[model samples]
Target: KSQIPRLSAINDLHKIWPTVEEHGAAIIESFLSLDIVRRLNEEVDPFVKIEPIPAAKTKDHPNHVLSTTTRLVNVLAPISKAYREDVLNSKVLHRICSDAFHVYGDYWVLMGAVMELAPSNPAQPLHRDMRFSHPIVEYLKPDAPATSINFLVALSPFTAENGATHVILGSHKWQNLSNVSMDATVRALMNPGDALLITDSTIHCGGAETTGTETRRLLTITMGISQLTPLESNLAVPRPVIESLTPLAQRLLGWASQRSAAPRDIGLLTIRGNSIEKTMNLKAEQPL
Candidate 1:
């Protein structure tokens, strides 16, 4: 149902779907143009203040945050369409969404200009993206698509010493945190403009910055489906601005919505002439 153009250059992504699903995460090399990265970086620095959930910080936070250049994210609004459609169209994202949102909403580049500073800020807690839950957490089923995968485009060289992002090889299968630490997990290092795509089930955290004056730069965005998702992606940008968006842009900014639903089988059992009747039904009873 996704009409986005095929990205032949990145079709290799199919090769890793099984592996990434098996492990909960995957590390993608550079997927965006350096020029695009630079422009996107410049455009995103004016909005969306990045804040470290120090309380959420740990030695194993999936990603780190140092100083965020807030208020710069609003400018990169145009690019949201391409990424949302192409990136979201991938098999992995579709699979995740199938299991996540009941009423899918649009994904948003909720924040930009991530600078993981030196000495590293505190670690973030191991958890799914905030999009996983809305009014409440328990309201969602265990198998529900509770969150979206995060695609972080490295805006700077993310060396191990520079507080590179890290992830547990296959923690997504765990479903819930095991109270264990991924301190020994592998680090996801990237040069400026590289990208890392991961699922909601992935267990990840940021590493301490061994050294770096400027914070590590990365674009933290999510791909999802929702109906109530706000315009400007909850960025607080005005709707008038969204009204002016290109048709594709409007599609990504929550003006368009999707809802994945479980199939109903009313015919499986019915009341006929005040008597019960039976019909065949097939559904996933137990699956991952």
Candidate 2:
């Protein structure tokens, strides 16, 4: 049996990366610092007011959950002016990203969401994150490169009773789901600061919360190639919020290249300008 790889040692990327490539997922126990976990939960505190779950996956059970998403730039920014450190250090997170998806091309945060599953929540459906890229993925081979990857960061402990995420081992290699069974899935049990990294093609889902009064909180950060259309557009983010982010974070949030354009669409600038500060000059296209 192939045991799921865990990162107990700090520099275990070599072991971790290969396992994910083979098994579809892996976990790093205590990957996040306590401070990082605290800020992440704290930032979402305002949205934690108890509310009935929106809908149910099945009629047999009801869903009770409170969830929300923080802007990508806001989540990466330093928590408060008084605190200089970030909840998650960008350098460290990107290092993991470089292996997971960057080898293909420039990568950026595709979407970020925080989920809080309350008591008696049912298990989520077994699905792949790549569903976002559906028709395109349908054409790729079973061993095709991952177009996106997911990091499920636990803001609270993940336990059998508290709905830890369950991933289907080796599911990434399956050409079809006919042979994949939910009974073969494994729970990614870990503490508050831990995280589960899985390929976009992996079959996984959040397990049900059987008995727990406390909320099970999770932060999911999905990253994908910059060439692919983002799952969520960051262009609509407020200017000030975008400005608060580091240049690295800003680029990851889609500011690096606002939008790609054909050569004809390129704006013009005076080549002879001396001050080095100038505005774009555009010539109106002729009407037919």
Candidate 3:
């Protein structure tokens, strides 16, 4: 099995980036810290545990369904104070993303959520995350910049028994993914606060927790190349929570306009005869 690179210093782009280029994934050690991660989990439990688990099938996505042991939660920025201030506002962590995509003001958080995989949960289906408009992924240039990246920051210590993510080395490049085998897959082992970063083109899936009582939890944050329709919306929360955030946090949450890196990128709230930038200033919408 392949070994995913483990890095302690995320700011070391000279070193950290090469691993991602070669492997399409890497584990950033202690990306948050045990204390903060524990706090996020503690604060999340009362709210998240209140919700029940999803059914095995919804039929909405014919190829996929919610795993029975899997639980999902969202809007951590508005619910948890640590997530809002420590995570959403941390430039120390944001620099890696900004530098990786060669963008600072051009990208934003496309989705944010938490996932908990309880014991006996089966492994997720192996697939590529095609959230972008790429008609077909096999022809995309192998060395080109990624359109989306997701960091599964550990909320609990990830282990093979407790369903750590399984990924294929260098599988983000051009290839026929349909004929792949499990011989090349590797488990992404991590402790609380460590983050396993995966590009959208990377081939991966959540591992099965067949023999453990412990649950695998992670805070998944997806960053997109500015012109994406985010999964989580700002209006999903009360206005007070968002209003108190810093300008940078606000900008990342789509509170500010996105300068398109490429053409054909459009806004959400814009329609016939609506001048957005001016009207959106109040709502930071009618734009972006």
Candidate 4:
């Protein structure tokens, strides 16, 4: 096997990242516009029975747990567990994933569904993306960047007032020194059609929304090498949906091809960002 995969992090970024500088952020109009966000919200809304977490109980927790802000649809149109087909089928979504982690069979995930932060929500802590990504950052040390790509599609207007996401600019280059503060980031002010491409190194936080009758919506989607694993247990997307997807879409959700690594038997390990398997496997792995 080649020591460096064709799509490994070091291979292309010198040429690719410059593009992001010229443009404030990437945007694909109506990529998953209001209509799609609303539709997905419709499917997810029914599950939104706000369960309050007692403040006292959460205070002593090892990690600061923020009360969730929006409804999520983890089950994609049943009879399927593949999320790529159901969620990542759009040309725009596929492009985001490809641009982030550009190889086939390297093992990445279509992690998280919709993440909408509304008013009264807490400000997310500043942290590195790799803190929550997997397959193990050490595994990709040879890959240069040593992390996965996390891309977000804005479904609604994301503004500083509405808690638009924030990230430390070029913090990716500052490896080893972690747990940094938010002073490094520029609140990624995004319009309804913009997309945010942040790497694991960027110190980011979930912003608090200030004004909005509508939940400041964001279709929180991410991709990574499959070796790392996802933050949640993904339910396969219905087979019918798979057939309907574009070729690029199928690849994002783990439908097109897959890494042959054995089913990971390790317990959950949470760091930064999100960790599906880590959070779910918590009970089994005490002190995790």
* C-alpha TM-score for every candidate: 0.61, 0.75, 0.83, 0.63
Off by over 4 Å in 2: 48-89, 132-134, 258-288
RMSD of each: 12.1, 8.8, 4.6, 11.2
Q: Top lDDT: which candidate number?
A: 3
- Give the per-residue lDDT of model 3 (tens digit) for 34-63: 888978998888876765655425433232
For TM-score, the strongest prediction is 3
lDDT comparing candidate 1 with the true structure: 0.49
Error of 1 at 44 (Å): 2.8
lDDT of 3 at 172: 83
C-alpha lDDT of all candidate models, in order: 0.49, 0.64, 0.73, 0.50
Clashes of each: 29, 0, 0, 21
lDDT of 2 by residue, 167-215 (tens): 8888888876886666878888988878898988888888888885757
What's the true lDDT of residue 161 in model 1? 73
Q: Lowest summed lDDT over 10 consecutive residues: which window, candidate 1?
A: 277-286
Which order, best to worst by TM-score? 3, 2, 4, 1
Write one digit per residue (lDDT tens) for candidate 4, span 16-56: 33443332223233444555565665655544344233233
